[PDB]
From Swiss-Prot:
It comes from Escherichia coli (strain K12). Changing N130A: Reduces activity. This is Ribonuclease HI. Monomer. Residues 1-142 form the RNase H type-1 domain. GO terms for biological process: DNA replication, removal of RNA primer. The gene is rnhA. Gene3D superfamilies: Ribonuclease H-like superfamily/Ribonuclease H (3.30.420.10).
Amino acid sequence: MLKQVEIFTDGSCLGNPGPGGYGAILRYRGREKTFSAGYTRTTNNRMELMAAIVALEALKEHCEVILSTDSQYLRQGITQWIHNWKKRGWKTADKKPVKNVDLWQRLDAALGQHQIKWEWVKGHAGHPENERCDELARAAAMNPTLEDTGYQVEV
């Protein structure tokens, strides 16, 4: 039985916007859960956040997590922006809401329930589970079934 929860995420999009999807692998309890869905019109950044979100929302108790991903958007959010965004009320310097505020707030809610250890992998040097997320993400985007409600060309 693993002593820490292991999560792997990937997200993919064919256009901007275009159809996209995500793949997340979750090692929780004695199982490996696999999550993946395609969206008719979204963006690569929105899918990368969705991967992380659906994985964490599955955890039903406070856990010790190790989340592994090569997603740069997630990385920059987590390491440079999120902190300052909470202090500023989720607004940009020109007082508009941040881009993808729907997802980042959603994600933030999921992250505050756990002790998280982030492992930023290089795209060409992750683990087998990262490669498999990539494969899932791509397959999903080719057969999109859901609508990405928070997507805006806009705000």
